Design a binder for this molecule. Structure first.
Ligand SMILES: COC(=O)[C@@H]1c2cc3c(c(O)c2[C@@H](O[C@@H]2O[C@@H](C)[C@H](O)[C@@](C)(O)[C@H]2OC)C[C@]1(C)O)C(=O)c1c(O)ccc(O)c1C3=O
Lengths: 129, 128
């Protein structure tokens, strides 16, 4: 089941790598809660919007899972994303340049294998250095 | 093995929470490698310098472990740090304000229970 949860996460990475946000969302429970950097909930709709913007802005993006660990109902992954910055993202004008950042994704799964809680830690300084 | 590794991580957290860098370093293997944000190794000496700078900078810091997961020889923690900016930091002079940041800490352990590889992801955005 931790094994099953890890596979689901890899499925979500694969969905990202073919630029299919809908493929990521499909793993969400209907009552999923996403948390921002201050630990405030963010609506699933705003989450989908940020994700859609990333795929538009970083249309060649590639995610490499550097590490993944599962225990109980939890999975954590450290991921590196590489892309070229082609579109506007979170107000930042494209530079046309290669960018690369590393982050954590933490996912909590229900007994049925759907994502019920979701956290991230991003170091986005390559975008605003 | 995962249980013992997680317990070691929490001892390292408790060392930080009493502002004792030595207590953290005590868990390292003799040939530990620490990777920076660009995955470049950082020398022991420089890592310890950064750790000391942080305690000088934020001498009232508190680490709150939000989540900890172990499997095999690795452990990941999602940690929230709260402090007051009382010392110079990464060149920024003190402001005296309450600050807060979140980070991932990932540690890989030897069979003997020492840290052999270590990564972080810091979100310093709130702090900046
Ligand atoms: C490829 O993009 C990213 O690098 C970001 C990112 C990545 C993921 C997920 C993300 O939401 C995001 C994104 O993160 C959101 O948008 C950023 C602007 C916010 O600062 C954010 C980090 O708080 C987050 O908003 C909820 C952005 C980016 C660049 O697309 C994600 O939700 C996710 C998931 O729900 C389940 C499995 C996953 O592997 C992910 C993600 O990898």
């Amino acid at each position: 089941s931790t094994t099953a949860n890890k596979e689901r996460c890899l499925e979500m990475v694969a969905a990202w790598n073919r630029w299919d946000v809908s493929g990521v969302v499909a793993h969400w429970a209907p009552d999923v809660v996403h948390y921002d950097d201050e630990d405030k909930p963010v609506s699933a709709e705003e989450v989908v919007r940020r994700m859609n913007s990333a795929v538009e802005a970083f249309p060649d993006l590639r995610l490499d899972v550097r590490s993944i660990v599962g225990e109980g109902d939890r999975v954590m992954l450290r991921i590196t994303c590489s892309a070229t910055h082609q579109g506007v993202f979170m107000g930042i004008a494209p530079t046309g340049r290669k960018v690369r950042w590393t982050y954590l994704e933490e996912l909590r799964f229900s007994e049925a294998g759907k994502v019920v809680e979701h956290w991230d830690v991003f170091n986005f300084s390559p975008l605003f250095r």
